[PDB]
C-alpha cells in the first residue's frame, strides 16, 4: 500500500520529539529511496557539512527496492512512533 508511508513521512514531520540526526538520516534517505529513487543527484561536492550526511545516507540506498525503503521506512517511522509518539 502507500497511505502508511506518507502517513509515516507526515507522521515524523509531527513528532512530539525529535530523534537523533541518525534518525533523521535513515528516515531522509529511506524516504527518499522510497519516494525519488537511488540517489539520482549530486553529492554536496562543496561542503561535507549535514547535507553530505543526508545524500551519502541515501545514496546508500541505491539498489533497495522502493518497497523495502517504504516498508521498513513505515515500520521505522512507526518505531519513532511507539518511542516518542505524540
Given at each position: 500500500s502507500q497511505a502508511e508511508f506518507d502517513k509515516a513521512a507526515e507522521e515524523v514531520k509531527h513528532l512530539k520529539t525529535k530523534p537523533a540526526d541518525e534518525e533523521m538520516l535513515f528516515i531522509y534517505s529511506h524516504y527518499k529511496q522510497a519516494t525519488?529513487?537511488?540517489?539520482?543527484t549530486e553529492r554536496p561536492g562543496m561542503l561535507d557539512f549535514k547535507g553530505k550526511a543526508k545524500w551519502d545516507a541515501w545514496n546508500e540506498?541505491?539498489?533497495?527496492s522502493k518497497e523495502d525503503a517504504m516498508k521498513a521506512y513505515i515500520d521505522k517511522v512507526e518505531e519513532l512512533k511507539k518511542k516518542y509518539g505524540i
Open positions: 525519488v529513487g537511488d540517489i539520482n540506498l541505491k539498489g533497495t
